[PDB]
Design a protein around this ligand. Sequence first.
Ligand code: HEM
Ligand code: CL
Length: 392
Amino acid sequence: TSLFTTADHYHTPLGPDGTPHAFFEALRDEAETTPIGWSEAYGGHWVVAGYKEIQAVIQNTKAFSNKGVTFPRYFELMMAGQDDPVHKKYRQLVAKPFSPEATDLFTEQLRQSTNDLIDARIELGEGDAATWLANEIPARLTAILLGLPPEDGDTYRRWVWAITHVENPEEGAEIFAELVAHARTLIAERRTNPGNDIMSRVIMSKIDGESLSEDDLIGFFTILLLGGIDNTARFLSSVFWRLAWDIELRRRLIAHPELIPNAVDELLRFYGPAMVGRLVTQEVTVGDITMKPGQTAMLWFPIASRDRSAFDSPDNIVIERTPNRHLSLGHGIHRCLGAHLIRVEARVAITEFLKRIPEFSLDPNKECEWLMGQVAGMLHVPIIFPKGKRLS
Ligand code: HEM
Ligand SMILES: [Cl-]
């Protein structure tokens, strides 16, 4: 028997600790023999698990297409769901607006908003770190980047959750219509009165004589919400969970805050939420396997992140690991636009949380829960801590 035959990113067996990592470790071991396997799930598809094999797929932009990023398919994501030439036109237009120098101007606002969120429950001595913090931080960050009051993020959070959970397509269309109406109002304001926020920057961007249309700008807003918020939330939730029980990791980050950036990269390797599809467009051989047009290949980044040929001691969080060429933020032409942003955001989140609440643990009377799928990680992380004080 092979673990590939029933591999299913929405149904990953969970271990006693609550995560899929025992299963991932077992699949990584099998991938040393069979780095690309056939799963019978979703009508049949390739599971690409070896690090070299994922790299070979993801570097191939001739035989694979990002029209297949979402799988199963039951609307185009700007850049993430597109191929060249349109992908490249959009990426060039947003490159400088979303540069590290530009997004770094928002760091101190992010730090303030993170402390404001912590204030909400610090006096209570309990909370769900995923619902209270991890889900809220990226949504408030989005609002901050757009020049809006941070609490406007609460609406973004609600939309993203609703869009991804409603069963009725008419209801889904109503929610998406709210989101689009907001984007149009924001765009009109930023066009008439440009500022220094990311939307103003994207509006003014011009490349080879051309600018983004209103539809393209709505698309950009949409991918910030639908491509950024859940990935970040699930990653941060997993990190908060790990810090709640891993007292040795925790004490080291408190004693050596200069190690937090390298630790963020190591936590990305270990808890990276994403698994992404590719549609096969031309016949192509990768290793021992020949893929055929119309098939789907799923890139199981978490397995590649544990490949012993790529990482020594892959099952350990070695916070000093460097370099760290993990695939959790992709690789090549679709590499995460948010890659710098989320590294800074995770540093701030960890730093402020451990500064405000250095003593905490998982709540023994409530359950954690791991969310499976293409964006995976802890969904509920109930913690307890000694009651503390609001900064405001
Ligand atoms: C921890 C949080 C995040 C993770 C793990 C993550 C992961 C990824 C991965 C793996 C890819 C490559 C997809 C592929 O190869 O098809 C990607 C692409 C992308 N991400 Fe992120 N992401 C995160 C946060 C964000 C945020 C906050 C933004 C907002 C800017 C963002 C925007 C994008 C966009 C626009 C792309 C497509 C880029 C392109 O196609 O050129 N992501 N992300
Ligand atoms: Cl910091």
